[PDB]
Design a protein around this motif. Sequence first.
Motif, short mmCIF file in Angstrom:
data_model
loop_
_atom_site.label_atom_id
_atom_site.label_comp_id
_atom_site.label_asym_id
_atom_site.label_seq_id
_atom_site.Cartn_x
_atom_site.Cartn_y
_atom_site.Cartn_z
N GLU A 18 58.78 39.47 13.20
CA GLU A 18 58.46 39.75 11.80
C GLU A 18 57.88 41.16 11.65
OE1 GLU A 18 55.58 37.17 9.89
OE2 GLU A 18 56.16 37.89 7.91
N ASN A 54 64.64 35.56 4.86
CA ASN A 54 65.10 36.93 5.03
C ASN A 54 66.55 36.98 5.47
OD1 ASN A 54 63.06 39.33 4.80
ND2 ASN A 54 61.84 37.61 5.56
N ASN A 174 61.04 27.38 -8.10
CA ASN A 174 62.40 27.36 -7.58
C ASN A 174 63.23 26.24 -8.21
OD1 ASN A 174 61.50 29.46 -6.00
ND2 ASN A 174 62.09 28.55 -4.02
N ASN A 225 59.63 34.77 -15.36
CA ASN A 225 60.87 34.07 -15.70
C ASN A 225 60.88 33.66 -17.16
OD1 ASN A 225 61.89 34.37 -13.14
ND2 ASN A 225 61.38 32.29 -12.46
N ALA D 1 66.27 36.24 -13.03
CA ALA D 1 65.51 35.03 -12.75
C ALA D 1 65.07 35.01 -11.29
CB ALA D 1 66.35 33.79 -13.06
N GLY D 2 63.75 35.04 -11.08
CA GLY D 2 63.21 35.15 -9.74
C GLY D 2 62.71 33.85 -9.13
N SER D 3 63.26 33.50 -7.97
CA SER D 3 62.68 32.46 -7.13
C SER D 3 61.53 33.06 -6.33
CB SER D 3 63.72 31.89 -6.17
OG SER D 3 64.13 32.94 -5.32
N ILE D 4 60.85 32.22 -5.55
CA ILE D 4 59.85 32.68 -4.59
C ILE D 4 60.46 33.75 -3.68
CG2 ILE D 4 58.75 31.99 -2.39
CD1 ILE D 4 56.89 31.37 -4.62
N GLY D 6 59.16 34.98 -0.79
CA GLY D 6 59.06 34.24 0.46
C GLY D 6 59.56 34.97 1.68
N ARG D 7 59.52 36.30 1.69
CA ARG D 7 60.04 37.09 2.80
C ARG D 7 58.94 37.77 3.62
NH1 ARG D 7 65.52 37.30 -0.37
NH2 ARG D 7 66.62 39.02 0.70
N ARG D 8 57.67 37.45 3.37
CA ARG D 8 56.57 38.02 4.13
C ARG D 8 55.54 36.93 4.40
N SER D 9 55.19 36.73 5.67
CA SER D 9 54.29 35.65 6.05
C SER D 9 52.85 36.02 5.69
CB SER D 9 54.41 35.33 7.54
OG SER D 9 53.73 36.28 8.34
#
Lengths: 230, 230, 9, 9
Positions: A18, A54, A174, A225, D1-4, D6-9
């Motif tokens: 990461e 990712n 989501n 949103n 429209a944005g989901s989470i 979620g690409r960084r811990s």
Amino acid sequence: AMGSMERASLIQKAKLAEQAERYEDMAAFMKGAVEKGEELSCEERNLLSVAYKNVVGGQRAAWRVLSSIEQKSNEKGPEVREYREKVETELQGVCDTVLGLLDSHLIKEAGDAESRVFYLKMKGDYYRYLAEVATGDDKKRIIDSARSAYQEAMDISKKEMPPTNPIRLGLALNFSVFHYEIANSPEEAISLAKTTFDEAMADLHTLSEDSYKDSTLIMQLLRDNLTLWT
Amino acid sequence: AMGSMERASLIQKAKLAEQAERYEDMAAFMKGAVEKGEELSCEERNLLSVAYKNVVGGQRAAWRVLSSIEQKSNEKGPEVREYREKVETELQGVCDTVLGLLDSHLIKEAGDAESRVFYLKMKGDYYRYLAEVATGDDKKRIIDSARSAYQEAMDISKKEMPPTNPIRLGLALNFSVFHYEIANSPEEAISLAKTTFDEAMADLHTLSEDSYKDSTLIMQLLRDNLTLWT
Amino acid sequence: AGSIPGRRS
Amino acid sequence: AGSIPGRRS
Ligand SMILES: *Cc1ccc([N+](=O)[O-])c(O)c1
Ligand SMILES: *Cc1ccc([N+](=O)[O-])c(O)c1
Ligand SMILES: [Cl-]
Ligand SMILES: [Cl-]
């Protein structure tokens, strides 16, 4: 290829990957860790999710570029279609891999609300990604599989988590995107986002400063949103 | 794996992969195109270079992250070293692949100054990348291989190209970085950058508006380095 | 110290 | 429209 490496070493290397922005490596390391057969901690679940988000995020972005070029073309030959199909197949393979990990056997061993909701949200997300590229006999079944996973997660989170819980909020975010983008149900998406936001607002007073920051972060995404949809 | 695909289809898909930011694919497509055995056009050479610059650039960035973590640690176990070694080996493999393409047989068939200088610059660059991670018996030979390729390219470009030629300028820029970062010759790096910049400045009056933009772009990079080095 | 970026055709 | 993201811990 990870069967010979210690679980703890796989986790350590996932964290290193990461930091190096090597997300394909990160995913392979976390896949190896899952396949050791032990349940995952909160931090370990996040590493699994970040890695595959990712990887598939890069594939989805590339698929959209290529699908757009392909739509404009509809003579350059079969190349745009062929290459979009190649990317699409690789994306579907990653989604199938994640779903396979959830089914064998993360979900069935997840007894706590925090872990079970987390994994069911993941299951909804990766069926949603399959739905984004689906066009054949099973598009409806893929959509219903996403819906079913999200719905089970929602039912648990409403029973077992406070309205400000970040996993509960991200699940609702989501699921609302699912309604708007996949299910052709924009009113359901708007209603879910609004009710989620309002219920969280009313529960913020119970939170510490750090928890408040965590929850309001995701609440802003719900608001973004709603601003786009209304 | 590309032997069954038409040369023109490989080139078309390399262009698509660039648009999709799929640089590993782009490199594989351009490797397939090279292996068809025909010389490469100006545009095709750029596609080859862009693809592998992106791939190895990602590997170099990851290697530097991991090497830095490893240096700080010097007990977490062998994991940081092991993973840095893995990235390092993959990077060396990519460099070896590019160098193999240049040696079999791009360089020997490159008769025009523009193509021969381009490929020799590439050869210098990928030996430089090998030199960045080298530590064993062959570090000096790797450095001299980079130096030799850059020097042959310089000699040709000074004989056959105007001082504003973008390939001539980019070669001098990268050779100066070689001197500063690899060869421990900062004075040579500064002298080369200055003389390159001044000779180009004096030749700008001969250029069209579009050529002027191309050349001054790279001249600015020379200036940026001189500002950092002096 | 910057080499040619060279990452966009 | 944005989901989470979620690409960084
Ligand atoms: C799915 C989800 C929910 C919340 C957060 N968060 O940042 O609090 C995620 O990263 C992901
Ligand atoms: C090596 C090199 C030289 C010049 C340019 N340019 O942009 O003119 C490159 O991209 C690469
Ligand atoms: Cl293809
Ligand atoms: Cl490793």
